[model samples]
Target: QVLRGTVTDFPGFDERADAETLRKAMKGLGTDEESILTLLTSRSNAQRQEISAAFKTLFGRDLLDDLKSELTGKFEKLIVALMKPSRLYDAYELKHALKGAGTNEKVLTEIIASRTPEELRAIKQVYEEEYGSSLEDDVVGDTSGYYQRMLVVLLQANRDPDAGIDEAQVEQDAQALFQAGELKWGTDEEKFITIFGTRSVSHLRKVFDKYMTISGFQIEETIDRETSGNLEQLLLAVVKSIRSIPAYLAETLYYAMKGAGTDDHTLIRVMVSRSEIDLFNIRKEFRKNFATSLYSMIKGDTSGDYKKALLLLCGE
Candidate 1:
């Protein structure tokens, strides 16, 4: 189930050379945005971090701050997101979603639903370290009802990542989900949370497959019919990610760029977050699902340095 990343790992990687190039790109009267994009987007995030450190030491200036000042709008957002460690970047995204006037539950759901246990743990730790508060604390404070319970369970990061699957247990879980929702009076939200949030992705995939056999319906269709609100959204996302992480992200990318005005935040987040992980698969899924290229979508919806950077990352 491992997905391939699009970013080329630089051969005989040279952070120093890359740093110098970036410094020159941003130092001129008008920023050489193309040069910045080429250098940053071509390298993996680990290489980008190395470039960041080298940029700071060689030029006595923080690369991120310089980039921020040099660029604006979506361009700035993409570069900034690319500069941080993925986990820390995710932590900041979640914190941003939680701290504002109202919570961006979609962002919260996407981050929680998409990550591996290790990645989620790293994000939680970074959230505490950077924000001076626990992610669980923040999540508990902001959300309520079954949605809150689901998030809390996921935030615990205690899901058995390597648990061996039992065919019998899978059958039982699938039946349990069917009974809890479709076969009952009202949806049993806790049962949905307990199984979806805590099971290994592999195990859950089997459960979902078996769920279809037993229920004579797709689990997702059942979810849509049976549940409502953010809790339903969360469970559906979990099922989507379990089924195919790339497809779920493809759907996210499509939605962000689907309508009149773009959802720049979601667009940038998915791009930056996936660029070094499963972006290649995401590209395939996007093309397959949308019947158009992700590159074309970005080219249509965005402009300036932002467009250039995104296209570069899209492997244009």
Candidate 2:
């Protein structure tokens, strides 16, 4: 969670901003559209309300009302949504769109992809404040089973780094893998599995070093020697390099869609979530490293609404 600075007092609120005041403030010393967007879009709902309160206390009118008058369409909607300090409020708006008549895919995707843990907490607060009901209840009311479950899980996932790894744990994992690979059943993959799955990134790195000192062969080599399947190799690789995961995923997505068959669901989700954040960078990295542009690969792979949305999200 970001440590919020104390809200600054705006003197305009008390005087009631007439059209002239609006013009003057809009043209004031240096209006920060970017900062406003970041605050309204990125800050916790609570912070937004706090900022809104400060804006009103000084300007004597709702900041959101002013912003609404200034902006329109999706941008306006986003700002308006941000004005309501609850994830519940956002969720409420989202559910409204998906139910009754039309499904607003943009809102669904935006809310799902953006909110962080702390922001989720704020969302919950906003939800309760606005609806007097649990957000999860509203979610279940609006969405069904698998898709719903997955969305909730994604929302709940702790993105924060976990604690350091344990050396004993790593050793146990290595031994488990050896047992899983070398013992009676041909190859025991458990050791590598444990090390990769149980240990946090920091701990896993240390465990890898220790494993190398103790075992003459690298973990990847040992896995190849013992394991025969793709899963076994994948487990080994996962335990080994965390940095390569995104690059690997991008490559995998490209191939899945590029040829005779396109995995449309995978393609759209990846493109949509990535376009605003890391997709552009990821595409560049993918091309530079793999000698094929991510965009070209994607273009060859998909068609129709899927292609249109993907390209639009990627900003063409």
Candidate 3:
């Protein structure tokens, strides 16, 4: 469902000239805050990196450190996050989720479940190289029970994306799920995990519909009632993604803007992470499902310089 990216490379881009714009943003009597965001928010990540390299080579000073020195609060937070490689930033985010007093399980499930095998494989590469440890081991060390089982298996990063329809397996697995959950008085978490955790996306898509037909119950109904905690969250997220990835993230962005206040963490991360990827599809899904556009949601929910950057990055 992807359409257009929110961020695109600047035309007639000169890495050195952009670097000077960045350098001048900080070097002059006052920081040119407006120009910095206007320029950087429009370029692709690789172009941003190119400019940063030139900033270092030309000024003998790093761009990120200078931006941090000049900009403050979430605007700077947004800016600095953009500078780091997206995969590498995800490694850091995953670590941050695990390193605190308690795990940010939503982030764990949100990020770890959403990636394709090779995309996640790259995250593992960054995590292992930077920390000298395995990402799965870290996940395993912190959690336990059925939730732990599913989470670690996902971190294995070998999802079979588009295998041919396993029509027989789909029926067997669909009926298997009914037997595992609704048919039995006691739910079998293991059976749920095997079918949901291991099947192909194409396979699961069929299984979800047939499960409803065979069981006279929605797949989510059983999972919602039978499971609790991380296992519940992880399974639900996986199914939504299987249904459609852009829809999965469109729901995330919708939730990210709370009536109580903005969830700046998710608001920033979703925009920064998906802006160049499936953001346009995400926008399309957001409108289709919620009956409101992503741009309007962020425009009303967010504020100040940070809001401005997000608006540009979110597009229409």
Candidate 4:
């Protein structure tokens, strides 16, 4: 949800500069890309103008316009959005791309993998403000199977820690889960709703395991029986894989980068965001499941700056 723009000697704004500021930002002055990216990528449009005016006064040109000319496409889009500090807007744009035909998988990966709980809440707000639709609704409509389900959970901004649990509630919830799954009547959408939405992560894990023992079937199997449509299947995957998100991400990255057109955006987003979080675990799970390094898979699948960025993020 990054809102990126430039003010060249552009038609609307006055050209201005602040020599002192420009001096500090210049390379000989010791400015590095990270620091520059940090500064330029963290301001709003209005803030950019103040700096642009100052830059005009200093260098006889608009700083924003200069920078704008240097960047382009999704990469530029990302950086420029960062400059505006409009993370929410950038997030929504990424989500929008992935949900439709010619989905931008890179954007999807970036938005989901990097977001903190607080950031997710912000994006949800920004999405409604910008699109006149709920972020949740858009995601629901856009994806299918486990990936879609996981996206919904991520969008709802829920996570359960795998560290500890309440045994009694686990038993209770698990039994409840069986009834929902075992009953011959209507589908147990309610059970899914409760477990995914209400249960703590620790408790949910226990519940999941117990349900497996009682029903002689995995939650995934139940999902197959009870749900239909692409969105429902996606939700099931999200729920079933709650304990193994990185593994799910690994699969997603594989698909996104495979086949004909390269989904560079998806590649960039997932690798970058997950690097600091569960990517190591994801790598392990990927290797365990696929018998190949996630790094190797990415290498075999993609190339160029997009690949370079993902490799860097993977610490490859």
Rank ordering of all candidates by TM-score, starting from the highest: 3, 1, 4, 2
Per-residue lDDT tens digits for candidate 2, residues 1-316, read: 1221112223333322232343344455644344455343334445556666666777576776777666554344444554654434555655465554244444444454344455556665666676666666655566653334434543553443557666687677555655565453664333444445434556656655665666666666766776554344354435433434345445545655656677554454444333334555556556767787765766776543334334434444
Model 4 misplaced stretches (Cα beyond 4 Å): 1-90, 94-119, 126-164
Show model 1 residue runs off by greater than 4 Å. Answer: 161-165
> Model 3, which residues run further than 4 Å from truth?
none
Q: Is candidate 2 or candidate 4 better by TM-score?
A: 4
In candidate 2, residue 210 scores what lDDT?
A: 62
Tens digit per residue, CA lDDT, model 3, 4-114: 678888789999998888877789687887888888898988899999899999989989889898989988889987888776788988888876448888888888877
lDDT of 4 by residue, 24-86 (tens): 555263343344444443333455546656776766765555555654554454344433434
Best-matching candidate per TM-score: 3
lDDT of 1 by residue, 198-230 (tens): 888889889989999998999899888988899
TM agreement with the true structure for every prediction? 0.93, 0.42, 0.96, 0.61
Worst lDDT run of 10 residues, candidate 3, spans 1-10
Provide the overall lDDT of each model, using Cα atoms, as 2-decimal numbers: 0.87, 0.51, 0.85, 0.58
Query: What is the Cα-based lDDT of residue 115 in candidate 2?
Result: 44
